[PDB]
Amino acid sequence: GSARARPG
Amino acid sequence: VKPNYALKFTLAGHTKAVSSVKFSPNGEWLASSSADKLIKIWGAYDGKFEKTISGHKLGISDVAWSSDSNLLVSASDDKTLKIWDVSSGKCLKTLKGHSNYVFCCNFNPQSNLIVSGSFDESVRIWDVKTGKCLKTLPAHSDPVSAVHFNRDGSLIVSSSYDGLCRIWDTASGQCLKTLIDDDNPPVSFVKFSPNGKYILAATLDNTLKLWDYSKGKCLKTYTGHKNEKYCIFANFSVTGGKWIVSGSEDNLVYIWNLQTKEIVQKLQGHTDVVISTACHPTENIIASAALENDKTIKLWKSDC
């Protein structure tokens, strides 16, 4: 995936 | 008065979360980037799929247009940015130098520069013509969530999970201003207002704030939505009434009156976090895009 689409 | 945005189109085709949508400056096109490693180009007025642009080896977190609408730049988990000729679909340049995911990107108005922010905690300024990294700013102490040029290209605003918003001089690379607020919650998004005097900053305490950055004063706040985990794009809508537009983690698009701070509309229909919204440059049209359990872009149209 992509970093923007992962929680954090 | 209040807007009456209504759903016009749902754009399907990405096979993973959509990460970012942007309208071309000339209004003809919507570009979408996705975790599925692709950029897709759609017609802004009929929603018709135009083309797929490919080449990143990992998912994409952001995409941006040049002022003449001819180029795109994308930011990828593969640690690169790519510059793309939209008409041909060809990758013109691969910008290498970040040491972790590239998260956010933008052209300056002149479109001779690109600015990028990365998980590597740096902001980089790149020459569009040669692809060379011109400056590496030790901008933050946590991932950089957003980067944006002001109207004349002389300033960059950056935001980071370290809780800071910073204003940078493009030519010199020095930090002109640091904005801290309350207990410094992570700053998930920032961008200049169209006239360049304000910045809109999102923090992961469910809050948007409008700032006079030179005076360092918070002029407005926008609340009621859910934003605790994701770097959600927000927008100034100025083609009709003056609104603030943002996605939300409760699957809605929120629209606020910029001056009164009241919510004036909530757009229902997405089934996952609305990670990205964009406002059409001339018509009262919003594009919205959502994460893995949705994978679609929606186009909305209002009379004001």
Side-chain angles (χ1 to χ4, degrees), chain A, chain B residues 1-7 9-47 49-128 130-131 133-176 178-216 218-292 294-300 302-304:
Chain A
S2 82
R4 195 175 293 262
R6 303 190 281 264
Chain B
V1 59
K2 295 158 64 163
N4 62 351
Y5 278 93
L7 184 63
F9 305 95
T10 295
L11 281 36
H14 284 297
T15 55
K16 302 239 208 243
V18 183
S19 58
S20 184
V21 290
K22 298 300 182 63
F23 284 108
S24 61
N26 68 16
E28 296 187 30
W29 311 107
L30 186 79
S32 56
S33 61
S34 174
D36 70 7
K37 316 185 194 166
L38 305 173
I39 296 168
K40 292 175 180 296
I41 306 303
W42 321 79
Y45 302 119
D46 62 1
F49 169 81
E50 186 64 16
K51 72 178 80 193
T52 297
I53 299 185
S54 63
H56 279 298
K57 288 134 154 193
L58 287 175
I60 303 165
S61 284
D62 200 8
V63 68
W65 292 94
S66 68
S67 299
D68 69 7
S69 301
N70 296 340
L71 313 168
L72 286 167
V73 67
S74 56
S76 178
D77 277 25
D78 69 14
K79 304 175 199 167
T80 76
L81 302 107
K82 279 163 181 300
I83 302 170
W84 304 98
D85 179 279
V86 180
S87 52
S88 68
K90 281 182 28 93
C91 175
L92 297 186
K93 290 282 184 297
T94 309
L95 317 189
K96 300 177 191 133
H98 284 295
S99 56
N100 208 339
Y101 317 135
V102 197
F103 199 83
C104 50
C105 56
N106 257 309
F107 284 86
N108 65 338
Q110 180 174 351
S111 291
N112 69 307
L113 302 179
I114 287 157
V115 63
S116 64
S118 174
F119 260 52
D120 70 14
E121 312 181 350
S122 79
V123 167
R124 289 175 175 248
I125 296 160
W126 310 84
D127 183 66
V128 165
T130 70
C133 182
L134 293 179
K135 290 189 170 76
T136 301
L137 309 186
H140 290 282
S141 55
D142 281 295
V144 184
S145 55
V147 283
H148 190 235
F149 284 100
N150 73 332
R151 53 152 306 282
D152 64 5
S154 74
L155 302 177
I156 297 157
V157 66
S158 64
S159 57
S160 163
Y161 273 61
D162 64 6
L164 301 188
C165 292
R166 283 186 156 147
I167 311 283
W168 306 88
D169 184 291
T170 302
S172 87
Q174 294 304 329
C175 180
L176 292 179
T178 299
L179 272 83
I180 62 142
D181 209 5
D182 297 335
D183 65 316
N184 289 6
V187 188
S188 47
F189 180 73
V190 75
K191 99 183 292 187
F192 283 104
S193 61
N195 54 20
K197 274 183 82 223
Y198 309 108
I199 63 176
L200 185 69
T203 49
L204 287 191
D205 56 0
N206 306 292
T207 304
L208 283 151
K209 301 185 163 165
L210 183 76
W211 290 93
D212 176 338
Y213 60 83
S214 65
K215 254 198 55 193
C218 175
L219 297 182
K220 298 297 164 185
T221 83
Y222 309 97
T223 63
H225 67 306
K226 183 46 55 133
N227 188 21
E228 298 184 341
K229 295 319 301 205
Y230 293 93
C231 294
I232 301 180
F233 296 80
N235 308 88
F236 293 86
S237 178
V238 300
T239 48
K242 310 296 155 163
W243 323 120
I244 297 298
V245 176
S246 181
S248 183
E249 288 163 6
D250 61 0
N251 303 351
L252 302 171
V253 177
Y254 283 65
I255 308 178
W256 298 256
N257 183 308
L258 182 158
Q259 288 296 6
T260 69
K261 302 177 279 185
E262 316 164 272
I263 304 175
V264 293
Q265 213 182 348
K266 291 148 98 155
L267 309 180
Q268 180 186 252
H270 284 289
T271 63
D272 204 348
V273 174
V274 181
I275 190 62
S276 172
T277 52
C279 294
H280 191 271
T282 71
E283 301 272 343
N284 303 320
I285 291 173
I286 291 161
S288 68
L291 293 191
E292 205 59 38
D294 182 309
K295 301 191 259 283
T296 74
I297 300 135
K298 296 170 176 292
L299 296 175
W300 317 75
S302 176
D303 292 314
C304 71

